[PDB]
mmCIF file with all atom_site columns, C-alpha atoms in Angstrom:
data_model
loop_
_atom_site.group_PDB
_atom_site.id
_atom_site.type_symbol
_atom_site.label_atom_id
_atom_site.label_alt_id
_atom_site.label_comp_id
_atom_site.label_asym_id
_atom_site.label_entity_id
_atom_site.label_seq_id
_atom_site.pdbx_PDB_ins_code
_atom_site.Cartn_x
_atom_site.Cartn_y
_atom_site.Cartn_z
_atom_site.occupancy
_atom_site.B_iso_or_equiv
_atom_site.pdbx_formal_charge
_atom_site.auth_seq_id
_atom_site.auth_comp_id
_atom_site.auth_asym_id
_atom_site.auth_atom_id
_atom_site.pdbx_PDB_model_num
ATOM 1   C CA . UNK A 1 1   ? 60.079 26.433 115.982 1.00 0.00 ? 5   UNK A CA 1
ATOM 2   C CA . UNK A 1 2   ? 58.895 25.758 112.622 1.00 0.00 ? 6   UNK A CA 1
ATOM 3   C CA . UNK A 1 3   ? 59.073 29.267 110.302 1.00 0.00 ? 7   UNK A CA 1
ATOM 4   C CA . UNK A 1 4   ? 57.995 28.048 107.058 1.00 0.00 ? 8   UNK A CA 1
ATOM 5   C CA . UNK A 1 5   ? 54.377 28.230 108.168 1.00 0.00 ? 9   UNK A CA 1
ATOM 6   C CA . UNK A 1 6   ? 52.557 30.019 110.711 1.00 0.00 ? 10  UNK A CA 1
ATOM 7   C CA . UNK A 1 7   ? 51.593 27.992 113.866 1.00 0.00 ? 11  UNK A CA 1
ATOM 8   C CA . UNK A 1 8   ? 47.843 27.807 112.909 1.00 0.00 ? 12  UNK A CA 1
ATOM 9   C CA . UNK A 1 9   ? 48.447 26.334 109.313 1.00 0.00 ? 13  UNK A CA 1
ATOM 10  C CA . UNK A 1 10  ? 46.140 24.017 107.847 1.00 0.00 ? 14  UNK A CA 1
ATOM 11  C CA . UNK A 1 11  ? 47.180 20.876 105.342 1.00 0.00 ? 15  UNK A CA 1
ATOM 12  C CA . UNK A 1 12  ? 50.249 19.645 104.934 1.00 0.00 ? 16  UNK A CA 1
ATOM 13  C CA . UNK A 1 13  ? 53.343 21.385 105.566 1.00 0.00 ? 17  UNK A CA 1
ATOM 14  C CA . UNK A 1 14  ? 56.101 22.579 102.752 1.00 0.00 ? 18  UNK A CA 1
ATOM 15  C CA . UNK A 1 15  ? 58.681 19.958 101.860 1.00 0.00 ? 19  UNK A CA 1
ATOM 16  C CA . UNK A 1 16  ? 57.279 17.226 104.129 1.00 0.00 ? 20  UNK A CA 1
ATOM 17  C CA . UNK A 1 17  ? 55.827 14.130 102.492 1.00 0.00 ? 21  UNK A CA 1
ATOM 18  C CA . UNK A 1 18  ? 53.645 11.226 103.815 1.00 0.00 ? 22  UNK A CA 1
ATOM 19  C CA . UNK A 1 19  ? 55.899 8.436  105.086 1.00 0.00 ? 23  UNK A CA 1
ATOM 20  C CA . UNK A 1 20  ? 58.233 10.879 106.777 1.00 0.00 ? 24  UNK A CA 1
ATOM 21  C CA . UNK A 1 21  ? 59.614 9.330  109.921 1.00 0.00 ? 25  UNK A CA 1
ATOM 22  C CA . UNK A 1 22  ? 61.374 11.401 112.852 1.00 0.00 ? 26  UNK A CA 1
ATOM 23  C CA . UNK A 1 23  ? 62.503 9.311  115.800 1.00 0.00 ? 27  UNK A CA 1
ATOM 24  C CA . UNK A 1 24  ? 61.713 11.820 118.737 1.00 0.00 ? 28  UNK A CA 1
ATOM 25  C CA . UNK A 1 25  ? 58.528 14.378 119.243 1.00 0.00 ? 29  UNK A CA 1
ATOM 26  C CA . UNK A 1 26  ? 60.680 17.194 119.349 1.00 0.00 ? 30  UNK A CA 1
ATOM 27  C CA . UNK A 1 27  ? 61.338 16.471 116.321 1.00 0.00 ? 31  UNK A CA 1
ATOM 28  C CA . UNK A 1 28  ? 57.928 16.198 115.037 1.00 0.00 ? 32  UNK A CA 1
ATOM 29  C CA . UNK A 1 29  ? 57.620 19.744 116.494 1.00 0.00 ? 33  UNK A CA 1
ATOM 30  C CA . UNK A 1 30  ? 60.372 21.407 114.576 1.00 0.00 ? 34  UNK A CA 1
ATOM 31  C CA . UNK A 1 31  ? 59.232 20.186 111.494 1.00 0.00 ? 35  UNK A CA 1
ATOM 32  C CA . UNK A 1 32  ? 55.776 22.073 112.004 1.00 0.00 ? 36  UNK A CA 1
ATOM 33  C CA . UNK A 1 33  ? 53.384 18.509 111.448 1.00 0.00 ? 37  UNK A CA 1
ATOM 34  C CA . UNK A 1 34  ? 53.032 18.622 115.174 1.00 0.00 ? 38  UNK A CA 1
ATOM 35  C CA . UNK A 1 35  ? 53.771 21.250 116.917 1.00 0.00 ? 39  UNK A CA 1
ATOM 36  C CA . UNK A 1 36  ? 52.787 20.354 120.935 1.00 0.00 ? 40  UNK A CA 1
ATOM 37  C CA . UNK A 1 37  ? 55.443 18.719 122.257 1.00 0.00 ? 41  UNK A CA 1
ATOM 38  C CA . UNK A 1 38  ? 53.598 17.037 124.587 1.00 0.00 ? 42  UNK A CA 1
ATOM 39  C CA . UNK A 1 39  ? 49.631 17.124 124.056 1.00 0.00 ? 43  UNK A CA 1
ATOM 40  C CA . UNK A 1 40  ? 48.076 14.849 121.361 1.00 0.00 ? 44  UNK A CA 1
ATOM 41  C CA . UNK A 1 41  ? 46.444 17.308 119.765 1.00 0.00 ? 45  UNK A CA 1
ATOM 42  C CA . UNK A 1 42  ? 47.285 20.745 117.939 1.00 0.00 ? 46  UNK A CA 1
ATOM 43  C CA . UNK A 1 43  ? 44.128 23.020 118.190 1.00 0.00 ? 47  UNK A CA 1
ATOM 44  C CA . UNK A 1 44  ? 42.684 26.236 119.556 1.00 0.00 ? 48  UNK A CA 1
ATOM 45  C CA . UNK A 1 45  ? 38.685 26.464 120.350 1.00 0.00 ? 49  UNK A CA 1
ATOM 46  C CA . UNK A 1 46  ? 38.355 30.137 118.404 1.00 0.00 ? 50  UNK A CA 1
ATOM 47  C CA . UNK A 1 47  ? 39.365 28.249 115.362 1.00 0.00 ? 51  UNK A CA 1
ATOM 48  C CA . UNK A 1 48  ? 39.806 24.771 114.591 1.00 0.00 ? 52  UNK A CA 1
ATOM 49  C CA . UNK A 1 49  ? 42.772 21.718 114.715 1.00 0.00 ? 53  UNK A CA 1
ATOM 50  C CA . UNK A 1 50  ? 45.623 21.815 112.802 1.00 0.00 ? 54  UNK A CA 1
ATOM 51  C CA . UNK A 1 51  ? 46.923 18.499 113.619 1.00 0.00 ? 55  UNK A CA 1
ATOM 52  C CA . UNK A 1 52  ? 46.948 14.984 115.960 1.00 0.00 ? 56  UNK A CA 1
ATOM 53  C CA . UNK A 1 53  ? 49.111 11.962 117.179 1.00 0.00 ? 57  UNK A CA 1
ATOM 54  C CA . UNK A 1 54  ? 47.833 9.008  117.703 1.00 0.00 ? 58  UNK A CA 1
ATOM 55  C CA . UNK A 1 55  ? 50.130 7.078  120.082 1.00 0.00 ? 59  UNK A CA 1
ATOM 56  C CA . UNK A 1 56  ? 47.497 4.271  121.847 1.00 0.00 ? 60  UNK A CA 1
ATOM 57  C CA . UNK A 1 57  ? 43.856 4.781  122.095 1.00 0.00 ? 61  UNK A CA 1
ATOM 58  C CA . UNK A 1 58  ? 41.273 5.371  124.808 1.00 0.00 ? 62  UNK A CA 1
ATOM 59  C CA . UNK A 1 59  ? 38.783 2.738  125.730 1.00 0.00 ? 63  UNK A CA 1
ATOM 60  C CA . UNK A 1 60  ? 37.308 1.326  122.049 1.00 0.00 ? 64  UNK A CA 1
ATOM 61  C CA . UNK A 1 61  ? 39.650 3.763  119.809 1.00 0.00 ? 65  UNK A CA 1
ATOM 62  C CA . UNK A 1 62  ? 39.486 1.528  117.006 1.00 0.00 ? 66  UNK A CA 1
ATOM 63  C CA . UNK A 1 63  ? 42.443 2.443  114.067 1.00 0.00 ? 67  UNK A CA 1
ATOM 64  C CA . UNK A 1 64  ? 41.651 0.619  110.134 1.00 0.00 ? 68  UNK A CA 1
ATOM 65  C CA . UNK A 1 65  ? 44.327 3.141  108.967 1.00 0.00 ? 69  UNK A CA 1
ATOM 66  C CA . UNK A 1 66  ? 41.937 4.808  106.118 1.00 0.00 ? 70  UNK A CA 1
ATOM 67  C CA . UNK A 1 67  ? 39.833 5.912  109.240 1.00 0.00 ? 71  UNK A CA 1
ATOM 68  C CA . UNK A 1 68  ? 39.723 5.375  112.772 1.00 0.00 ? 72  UNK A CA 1
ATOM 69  C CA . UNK A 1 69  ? 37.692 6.551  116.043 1.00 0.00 ? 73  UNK A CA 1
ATOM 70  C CA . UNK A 1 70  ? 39.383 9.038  118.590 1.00 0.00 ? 74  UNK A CA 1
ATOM 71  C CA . UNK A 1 71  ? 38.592 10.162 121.952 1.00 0.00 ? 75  UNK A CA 1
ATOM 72  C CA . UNK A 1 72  ? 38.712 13.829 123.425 1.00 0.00 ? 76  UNK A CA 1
ATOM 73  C CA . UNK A 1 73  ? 40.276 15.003 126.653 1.00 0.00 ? 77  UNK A CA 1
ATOM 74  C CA . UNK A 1 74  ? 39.762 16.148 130.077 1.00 0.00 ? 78  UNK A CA 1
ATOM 75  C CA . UNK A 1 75  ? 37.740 14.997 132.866 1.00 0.00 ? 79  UNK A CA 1
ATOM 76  C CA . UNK A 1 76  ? 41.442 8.022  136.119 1.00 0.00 ? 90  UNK A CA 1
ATOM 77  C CA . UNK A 1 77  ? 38.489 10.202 134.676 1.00 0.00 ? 91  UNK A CA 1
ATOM 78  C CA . UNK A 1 78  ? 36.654 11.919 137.891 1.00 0.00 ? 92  UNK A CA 1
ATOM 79  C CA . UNK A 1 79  ? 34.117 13.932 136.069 1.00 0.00 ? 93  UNK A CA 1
ATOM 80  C CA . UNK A 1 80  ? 32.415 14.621 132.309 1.00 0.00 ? 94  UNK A CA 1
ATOM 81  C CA . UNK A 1 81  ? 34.470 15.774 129.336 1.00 0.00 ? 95  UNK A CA 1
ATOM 82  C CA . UNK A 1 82  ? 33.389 19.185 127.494 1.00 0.00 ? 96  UNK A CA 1
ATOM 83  C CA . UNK A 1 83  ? 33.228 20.308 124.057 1.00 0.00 ? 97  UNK A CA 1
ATOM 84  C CA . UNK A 1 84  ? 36.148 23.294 125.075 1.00 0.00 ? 98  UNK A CA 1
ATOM 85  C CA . UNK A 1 85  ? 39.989 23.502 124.184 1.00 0.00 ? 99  UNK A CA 1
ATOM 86  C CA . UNK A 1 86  ? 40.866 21.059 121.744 1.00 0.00 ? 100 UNK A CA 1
ATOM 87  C CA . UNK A 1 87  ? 37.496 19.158 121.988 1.00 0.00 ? 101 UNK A CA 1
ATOM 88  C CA . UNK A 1 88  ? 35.946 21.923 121.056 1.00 0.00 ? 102 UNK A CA 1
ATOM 89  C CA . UNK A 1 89  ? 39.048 22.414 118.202 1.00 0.00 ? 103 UNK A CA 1
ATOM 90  C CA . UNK A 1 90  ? 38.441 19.294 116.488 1.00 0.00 ? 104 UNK A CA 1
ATOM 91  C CA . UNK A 1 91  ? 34.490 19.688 116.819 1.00 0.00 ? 105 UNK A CA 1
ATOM 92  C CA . UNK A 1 92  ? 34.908 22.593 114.514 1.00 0.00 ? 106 UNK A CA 1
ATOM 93  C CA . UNK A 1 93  ? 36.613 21.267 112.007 1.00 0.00 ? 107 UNK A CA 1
ATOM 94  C CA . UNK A 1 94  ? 33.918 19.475 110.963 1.00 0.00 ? 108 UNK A CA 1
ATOM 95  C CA . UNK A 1 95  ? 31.440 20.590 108.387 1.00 0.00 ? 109 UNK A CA 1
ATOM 96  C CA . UNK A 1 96  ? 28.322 20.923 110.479 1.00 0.00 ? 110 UNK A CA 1
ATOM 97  C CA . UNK A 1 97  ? 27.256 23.956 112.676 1.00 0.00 ? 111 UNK A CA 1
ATOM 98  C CA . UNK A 1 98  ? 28.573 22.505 116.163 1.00 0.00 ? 112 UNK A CA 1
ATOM 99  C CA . UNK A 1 99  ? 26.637 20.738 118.472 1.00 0.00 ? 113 UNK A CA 1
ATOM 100 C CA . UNK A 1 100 ? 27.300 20.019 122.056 1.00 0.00 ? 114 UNK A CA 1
ATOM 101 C CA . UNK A 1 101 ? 24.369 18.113 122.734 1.00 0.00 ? 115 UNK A CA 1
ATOM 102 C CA . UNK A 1 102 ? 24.535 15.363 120.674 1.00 0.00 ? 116 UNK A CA 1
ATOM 103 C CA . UNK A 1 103 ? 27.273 15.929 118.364 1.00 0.00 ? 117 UNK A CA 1
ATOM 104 C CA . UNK A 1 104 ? 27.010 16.269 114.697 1.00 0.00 ? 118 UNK A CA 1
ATOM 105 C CA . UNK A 1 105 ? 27.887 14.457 111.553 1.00 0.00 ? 119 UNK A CA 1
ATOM 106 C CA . UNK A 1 106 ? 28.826 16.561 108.153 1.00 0.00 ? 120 UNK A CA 1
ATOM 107 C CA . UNK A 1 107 ? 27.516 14.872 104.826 1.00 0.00 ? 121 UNK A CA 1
ATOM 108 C CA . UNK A 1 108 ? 29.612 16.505 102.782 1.00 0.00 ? 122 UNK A CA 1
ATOM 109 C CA . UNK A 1 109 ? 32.743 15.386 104.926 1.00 0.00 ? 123 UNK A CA 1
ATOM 110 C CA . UNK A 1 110 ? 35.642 16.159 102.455 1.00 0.00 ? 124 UNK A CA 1
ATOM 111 C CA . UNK A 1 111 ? 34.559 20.668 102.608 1.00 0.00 ? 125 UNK A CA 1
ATOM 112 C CA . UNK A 1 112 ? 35.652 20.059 106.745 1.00 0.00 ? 126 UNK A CA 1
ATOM 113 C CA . UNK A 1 113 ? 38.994 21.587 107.526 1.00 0.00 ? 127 UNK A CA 1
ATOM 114 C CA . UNK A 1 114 ? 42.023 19.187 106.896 1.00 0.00 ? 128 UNK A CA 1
ATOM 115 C CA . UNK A 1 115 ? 43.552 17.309 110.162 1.00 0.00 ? 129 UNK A CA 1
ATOM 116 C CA . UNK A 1 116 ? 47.794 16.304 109.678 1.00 0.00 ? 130 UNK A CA 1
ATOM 117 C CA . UNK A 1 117 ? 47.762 12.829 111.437 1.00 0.00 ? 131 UNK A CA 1
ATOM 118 C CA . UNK A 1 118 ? 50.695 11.604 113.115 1.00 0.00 ? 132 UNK A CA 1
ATOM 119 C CA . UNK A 1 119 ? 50.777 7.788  114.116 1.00 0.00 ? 133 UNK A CA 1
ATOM 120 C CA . UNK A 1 120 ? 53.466 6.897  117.185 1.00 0.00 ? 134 UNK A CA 1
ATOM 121 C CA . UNK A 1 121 ? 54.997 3.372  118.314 1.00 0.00 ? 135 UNK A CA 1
ATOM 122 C CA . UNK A 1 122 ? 52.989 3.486  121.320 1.00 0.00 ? 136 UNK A CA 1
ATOM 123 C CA . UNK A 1 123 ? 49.978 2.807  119.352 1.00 0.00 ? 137 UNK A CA 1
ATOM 124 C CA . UNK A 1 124 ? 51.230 -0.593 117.805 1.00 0.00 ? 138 UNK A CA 1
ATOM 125 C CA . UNK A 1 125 ? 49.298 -2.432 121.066 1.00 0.00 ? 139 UNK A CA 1
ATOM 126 C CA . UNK A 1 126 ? 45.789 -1.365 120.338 1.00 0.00 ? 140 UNK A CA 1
ATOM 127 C CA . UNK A 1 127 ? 46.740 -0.517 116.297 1.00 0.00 ? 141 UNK A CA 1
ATOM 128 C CA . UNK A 1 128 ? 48.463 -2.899 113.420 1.00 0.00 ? 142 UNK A CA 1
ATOM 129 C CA . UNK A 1 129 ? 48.808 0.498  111.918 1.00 0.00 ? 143 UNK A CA 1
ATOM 130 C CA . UNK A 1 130 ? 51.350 2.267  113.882 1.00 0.00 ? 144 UNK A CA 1
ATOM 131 C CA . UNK A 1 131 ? 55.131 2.348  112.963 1.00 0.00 ? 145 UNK A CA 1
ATOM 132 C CA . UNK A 1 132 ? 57.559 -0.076 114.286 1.00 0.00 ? 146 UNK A CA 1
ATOM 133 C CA . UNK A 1 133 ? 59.882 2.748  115.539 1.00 0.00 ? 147 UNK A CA 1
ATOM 134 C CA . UNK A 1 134 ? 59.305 6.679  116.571 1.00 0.00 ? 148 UNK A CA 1
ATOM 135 C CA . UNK A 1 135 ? 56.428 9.188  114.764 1.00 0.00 ? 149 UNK A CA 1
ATOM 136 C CA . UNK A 1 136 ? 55.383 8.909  110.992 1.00 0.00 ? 150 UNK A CA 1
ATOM 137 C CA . UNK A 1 137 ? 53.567 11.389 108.852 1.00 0.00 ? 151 UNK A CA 1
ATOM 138 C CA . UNK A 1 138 ? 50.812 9.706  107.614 1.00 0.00 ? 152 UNK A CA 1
ATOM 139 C CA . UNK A 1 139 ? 48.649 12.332 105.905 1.00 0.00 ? 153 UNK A CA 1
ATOM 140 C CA . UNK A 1 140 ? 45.285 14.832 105.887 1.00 0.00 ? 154 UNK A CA 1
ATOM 141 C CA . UNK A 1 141 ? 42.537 13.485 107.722 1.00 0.00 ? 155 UNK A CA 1
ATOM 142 C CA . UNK A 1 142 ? 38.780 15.313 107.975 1.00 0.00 ? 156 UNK A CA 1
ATOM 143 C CA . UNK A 1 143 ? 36.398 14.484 110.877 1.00 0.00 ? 157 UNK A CA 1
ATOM 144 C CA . UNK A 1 144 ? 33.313 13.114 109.680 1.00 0.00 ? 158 UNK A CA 1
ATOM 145 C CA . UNK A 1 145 ? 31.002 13.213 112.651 1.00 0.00 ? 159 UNK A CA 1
ATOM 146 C CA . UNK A 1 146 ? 31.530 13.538 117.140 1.00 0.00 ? 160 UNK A CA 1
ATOM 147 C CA . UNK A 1 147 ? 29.492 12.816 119.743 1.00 0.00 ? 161 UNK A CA 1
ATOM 148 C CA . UNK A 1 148 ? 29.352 12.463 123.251 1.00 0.00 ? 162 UNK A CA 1
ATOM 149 C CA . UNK A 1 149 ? 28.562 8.413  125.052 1.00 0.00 ? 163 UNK A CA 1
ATOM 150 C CA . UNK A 1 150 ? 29.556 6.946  128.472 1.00 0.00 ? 164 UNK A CA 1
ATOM 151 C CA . UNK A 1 151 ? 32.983 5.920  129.058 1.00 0.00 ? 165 UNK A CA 1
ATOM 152 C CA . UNK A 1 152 ? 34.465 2.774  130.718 1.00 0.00 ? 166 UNK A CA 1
ATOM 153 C CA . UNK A 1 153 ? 34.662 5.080  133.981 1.00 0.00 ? 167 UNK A CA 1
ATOM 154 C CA . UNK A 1 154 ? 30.821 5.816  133.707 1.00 0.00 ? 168 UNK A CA 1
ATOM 155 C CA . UNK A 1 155 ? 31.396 9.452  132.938 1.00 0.00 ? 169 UNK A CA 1
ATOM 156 C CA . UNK A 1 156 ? 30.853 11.413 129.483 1.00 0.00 ? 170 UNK A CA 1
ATOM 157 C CA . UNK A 1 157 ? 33.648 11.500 126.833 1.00 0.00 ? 171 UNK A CA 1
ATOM 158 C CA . UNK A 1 158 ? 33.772 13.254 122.942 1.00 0.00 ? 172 UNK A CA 1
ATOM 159 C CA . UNK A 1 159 ? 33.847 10.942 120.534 1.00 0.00 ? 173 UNK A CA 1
ATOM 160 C CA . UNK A 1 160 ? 35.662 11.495 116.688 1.00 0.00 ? 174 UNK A CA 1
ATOM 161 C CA . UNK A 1 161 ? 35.576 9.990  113.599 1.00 0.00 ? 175 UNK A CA 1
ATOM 162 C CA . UNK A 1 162 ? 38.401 10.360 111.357 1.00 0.00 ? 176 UNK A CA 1
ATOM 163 C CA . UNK A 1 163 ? 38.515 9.654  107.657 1.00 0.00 ? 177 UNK A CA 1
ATOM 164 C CA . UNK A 1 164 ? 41.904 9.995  105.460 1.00 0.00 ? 178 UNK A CA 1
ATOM 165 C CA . UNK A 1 165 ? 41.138 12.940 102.468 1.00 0.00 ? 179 UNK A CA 1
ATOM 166 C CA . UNK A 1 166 ? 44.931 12.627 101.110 1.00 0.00 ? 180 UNK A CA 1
ATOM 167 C CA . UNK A 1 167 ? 46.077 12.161 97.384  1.00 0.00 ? 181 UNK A CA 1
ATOM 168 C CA . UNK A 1 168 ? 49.398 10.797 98.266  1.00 0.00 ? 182 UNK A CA 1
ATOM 169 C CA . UNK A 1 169 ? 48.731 7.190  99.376  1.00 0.00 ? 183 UNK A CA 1
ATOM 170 C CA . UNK A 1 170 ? 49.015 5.168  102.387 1.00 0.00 ? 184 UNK A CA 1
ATOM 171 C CA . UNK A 1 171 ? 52.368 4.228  103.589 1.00 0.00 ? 185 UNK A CA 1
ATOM 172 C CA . UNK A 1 172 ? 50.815 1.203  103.933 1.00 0.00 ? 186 UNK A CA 1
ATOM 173 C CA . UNK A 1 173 ? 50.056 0.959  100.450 1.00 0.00 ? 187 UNK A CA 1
ATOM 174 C CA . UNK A 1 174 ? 51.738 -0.962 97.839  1.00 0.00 ? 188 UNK A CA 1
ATOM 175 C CA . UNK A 1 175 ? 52.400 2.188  96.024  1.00 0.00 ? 189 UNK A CA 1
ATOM 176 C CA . UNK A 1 176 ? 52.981 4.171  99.269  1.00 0.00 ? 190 UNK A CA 1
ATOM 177 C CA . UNK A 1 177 ? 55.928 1.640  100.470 1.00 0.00 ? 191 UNK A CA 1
ATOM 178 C CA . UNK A 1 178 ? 57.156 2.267  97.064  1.00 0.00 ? 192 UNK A CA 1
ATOM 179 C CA . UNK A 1 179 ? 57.239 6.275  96.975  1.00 0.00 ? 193 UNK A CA 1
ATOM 180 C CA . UNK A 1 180 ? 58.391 6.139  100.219 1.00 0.00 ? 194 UNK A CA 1
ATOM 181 C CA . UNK A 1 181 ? 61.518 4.076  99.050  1.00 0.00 ? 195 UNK A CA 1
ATOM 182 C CA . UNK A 1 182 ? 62.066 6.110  96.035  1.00 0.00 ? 196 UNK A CA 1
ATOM 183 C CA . UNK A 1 183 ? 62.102 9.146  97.954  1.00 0.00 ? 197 UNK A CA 1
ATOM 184 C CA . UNK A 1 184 ? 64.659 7.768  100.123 1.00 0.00 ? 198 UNK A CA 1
ATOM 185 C CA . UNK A 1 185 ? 62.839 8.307  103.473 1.00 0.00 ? 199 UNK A CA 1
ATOM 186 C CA . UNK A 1 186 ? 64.703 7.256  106.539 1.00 0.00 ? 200 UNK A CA 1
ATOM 187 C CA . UNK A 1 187 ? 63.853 7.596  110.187 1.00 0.00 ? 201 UNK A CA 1
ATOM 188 C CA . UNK A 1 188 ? 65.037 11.063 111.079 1.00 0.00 ? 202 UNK A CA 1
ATOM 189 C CA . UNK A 1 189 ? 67.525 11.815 114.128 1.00 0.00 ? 203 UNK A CA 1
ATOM 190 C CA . UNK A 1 190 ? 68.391 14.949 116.134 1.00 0.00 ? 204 UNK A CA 1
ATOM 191 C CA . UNK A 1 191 ? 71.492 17.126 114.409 1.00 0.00 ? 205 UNK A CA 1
ATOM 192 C CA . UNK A 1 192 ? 73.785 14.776 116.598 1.00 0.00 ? 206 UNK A CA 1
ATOM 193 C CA . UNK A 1 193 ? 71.966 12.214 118.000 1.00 0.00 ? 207 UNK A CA 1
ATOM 194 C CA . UNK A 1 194 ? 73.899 10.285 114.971 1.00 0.00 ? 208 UNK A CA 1
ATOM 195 C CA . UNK A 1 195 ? 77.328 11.901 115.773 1.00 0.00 ? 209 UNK A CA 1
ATOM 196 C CA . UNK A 1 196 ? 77.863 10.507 119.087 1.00 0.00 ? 210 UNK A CA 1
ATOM 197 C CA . UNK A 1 197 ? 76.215 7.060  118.269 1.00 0.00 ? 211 UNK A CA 1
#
């Protein structure tokens, strides 16, 4: 469990820069970025999200790596999702008194409470922006606006949209590829793992 930061930390986390690469999500979860090991999303309703993987959309999750759309949880989906839990976690994070009606959509975007976005392999079928191999650390993301529509199983799903708020760039980024070389970033194993193999 990561010490250098309390569990419900927001922004980016001490000594951990964009572009950092670990191979497995317990990993990820040591280092504080994400610390679920299994859920996609690190949040609690009674205050906001600290952080999110992204590891192969729902329905018409679209990813253009600067931003991208997200779907909640909850509800084969049998019945409508609700603005609780981490719905309800990433909701607030966005600067607009919350809405469970119809959403809500924050004009000044950038005051919303920062999001650490993870991207996973699994995501490179529906995503040219996921990493060839295990988890990377791509940044702060703020929600812009959420709202509620029909899903492909006819019942009601939360709807996000994400939007990158980071000064280090993109590690897809000319300059991002570079940092990331400089800083000599490799894809991170378990204490081990690279002992026996």
């Amino acid at each position: 469990e990561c010490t250098i930061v309390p569990s419900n930390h927001y922004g980016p986390i001490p000594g951990i820069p964009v572009g950092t690469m670990w191979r497995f999500r317990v990993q990820v979860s040591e280092s504080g970025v994400h610390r679920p090991h299994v859920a996609g999303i690190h949040g609690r309703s009674n205050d906001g999200a600290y952080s999110l993987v992204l590891a192969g959309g729902y329905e018409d999750d679209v990813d253009h790596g600067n931003f991208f759309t997200y779907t909640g949880s909850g509800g084969e989906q049998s019945c409508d999702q609700k603005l609780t839990n981490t719905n309800r976690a990433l909701a607030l994070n966005c600067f607009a008194p919350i809405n469970d009606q119809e959403g809500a959509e924050a004009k000044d975007w950038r005051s919303g409470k920062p999001v650490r976005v993870v991207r996973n392999v699994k995501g490179g079928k529906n995503s040219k922006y996921a990493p060839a191999e295990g988890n990377r650390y791509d940044g702060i993301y703020k929600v812009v606006k959420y709202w509620p529509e029909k899903g492909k199983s006819g019942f009601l799903v939360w709807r996000y949209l994400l939007r990158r708020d980071d000064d280090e760039p993109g590690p897809w980024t000319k300059e991002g590829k570079d940092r990331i070389k400089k800083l000599g970033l490799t894809m991170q194993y378990p204490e081990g793992y690279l002992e026996a193999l």
